[PDB]
Structure formats: structure tokens, C-alpha cells
Design a protein around this ligand. Structure first.
Ligand code: MG
Length: 275
């Protein structure tokens, strides 16, 4: 019941898109390669690629990344304790003016979850938000994360327009997942997580780029459980977002969900800006 519409590559005022950002929870950089995730990146040819759940360090990266032309500025963050879990990457054609790691809070900065890249007219944040876990074992920690992240982004957005992208591990509203009723007590659709997302949009403020453009479009998901053939059945959740400072809405051309790109239990999302 879902086919992503064609790429809209001009802005509301007819200006051509010039900046293409792709974000993807890859479920392990090495498995993602074995599952032919990198071939797709080459076709998409984004100016900036944000990756979540790399499960990799800046110390143990695959060598294919070094030969990706068009994405030669590469920044990585992995947990401070063990390796093989979480982790994020940000790869850019253009060198950012400044790259920083984490959200300025030691409590929340030990799991390789956030990279901040400052560009000329905007700041890009990519995030892998803590999953509330099986049995919601981490829901209280996730609530702490949500507040600290919100406060961090509010301060960031006070100085420069913000693009936040990544796996935010929440389906905001019922339209954002195939089975809302059955998941209201499962990670990603608890009232606590949904309210945190709503407060994030209102507080910073940020706009949900996809839902701004497609306010009434159902069955549009970016994650499906590996099990039970969920992806072939489109039993999914929209967990991956581009959230934009409002001043970037005149530059917004499109916000895509790359449903057919394989390699992970998430699919990529792609943003087009006329910037
Ligand atoms: Mg995973």
C-alpha cells in the first residue's frame, strides 16, 4: 500500500535542489557491505551520507570506505566501552567547518550516538537514539536522553539552522507504524517516546520534513523487523527522520524513503535541499 513518490528536485519557489543528504541505519557496517548496501550508495551519490549502527570504531574501518569517491571527509564515533554495537558515521563531499561528537553530556556520550558537522549556512546532526529495549528495560534512560538531546539541539539551533537526521527510534503518530494498538507498550511507540518526539518538534522547533510534505500519506515506513517476513508485508515503522529548522522549509525540495534499497532492517532516507 506504499510507493514513495518521484523525487521532487525543485523548491516551492522553483529553485533546483543542490544538496542531497542520505541517512541510513545500516545494522552493522560490515554486514551491510556483505548485504550490498554500498552499491546503493554509489547509485544515490549523496553529498553527505549519515550512517547509524555502524558497530565499528574509527580504529577498525573497512577499506572500501577509503575508495568511495565523493565522500572523502569521514567522521566516526563508537562507544567508549565495548565495540560491536551502536556507532555512527558522517561522510561528506565537502569538508565541514567543524566536527564535534556527542551532545555535551558525559552521561549520554558513551555509546557513539551523535556527530555534529557545521557547514556554511547550517549545522548537520546525525543521531542513533537509544532504543528503549526489549521489555522497555531502557525506557527510563531513554527519557533522560530525550530531555538532554532536546536541550542540546535547542542551543545548537539558536546559532545556526539545523538538519537533524537519523534513526530516532520513535514512530511519532499512529500513521507512522502499521500496528499502533499492538505496540503502544513496545519500544518505539510508548507514550513517553512519542511525547518526547512531539516536545522535540515544539521546543527546538523542528519540522518533520517527510510529514510536512506528505501529511496524510500512510504506510510509509523506514524499519521492518527482520523476522516474520515483515518487510515483504510492509509491517513497518517510520523511525528515520530528517528534522529541519523552519528556516530551511523554503529550501526543502523533497524527503524520500528509499523503500527498495536493501542491506538492513532499515531503509535509507534522502533529503533534497535547494541550498
Ligand atoms: Mg540493529
Amino acid at each position: 500500500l506504499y510507493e514513495d513518490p518521484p523525487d521532487q528536485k525543485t523548491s516551492p519557489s522553483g529553485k533546483p535542489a543542490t544538496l542531497k543528504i542520505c541517512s541510513w541505519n545500516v545494522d552493522g557496517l560490515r554486514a551491510w557491505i556483505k548485504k550490498k548496501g554500498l552499491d546503493w550508495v554509489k547509485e544515490e551519490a549523496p553529498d553527505i551520507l549519515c550512517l547509524q549502527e555502524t558497530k565499528c570504531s574509527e580504529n577498525k574501518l573497512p577499506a572500501e570506505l577509503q575508495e568511495l569517491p565523493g565522500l572523502s571527509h569521514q567522521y566516526w564515533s563508537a562507544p567508549s566501552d565495548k565495540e560491536g554495537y551502536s556507532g555512527v558515521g558522517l561522510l561528506s563531499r565537502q569538508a565541514p567547518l567543524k566536527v564535534s561528537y556527542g551532545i555535551g553530556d558525559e552521561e549520554h556520550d558513551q555509546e557513539g550516538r551523535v556527530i555534529v558537522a557545521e557547514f556554511d549556512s547550517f549545522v548537520l546532526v546525525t543521531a542513533y537514539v537509544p532504543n528503549a529495549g526489549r521489555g522497555l528495560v531502557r525506557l527510563e534512560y531513554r527519557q533522560r536522553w530525550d530531555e538532554a538531546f532536546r536541550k542540546f539541539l535547542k542551543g545548537l539551533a539558536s546559532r545556526k539552522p539545523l538538519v537533524l537526521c537519523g534513526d530516532l527510534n520513535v514512530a511519532h503518530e499512529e500513521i507512522d507504524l502499521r500496528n499502533p494498538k499492538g505496540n503502544k507498550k513496545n519500544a518505539g511507540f510508548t507514550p513517553q517516546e512519542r511525547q518526547g518526539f512531539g516536545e522535540l518538534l515544539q521546543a527546538v522547533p523542528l519540522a518533520d520534513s517527510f510529514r510536512h510534505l506528505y501529511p496524510n500519506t500512510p504506510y510509509a515506513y523506514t524499519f521492518w523487523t527482520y523476522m516474520m517476513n515483515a518487510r515483504s508485508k510492509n509491517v513497518g515503522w517510520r523511525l528515520d527522520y530528517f528534522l529541519l529548522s523552519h528556516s530551511l522549509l523554503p529550501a526543502l525540495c523533497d524527503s524520500k524513503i528509499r523503500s527498495k534499497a536493501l542491506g538492513s532492517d532499515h531503509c535509507p532516507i534522502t533529503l533534497y535541499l535547494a541550498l
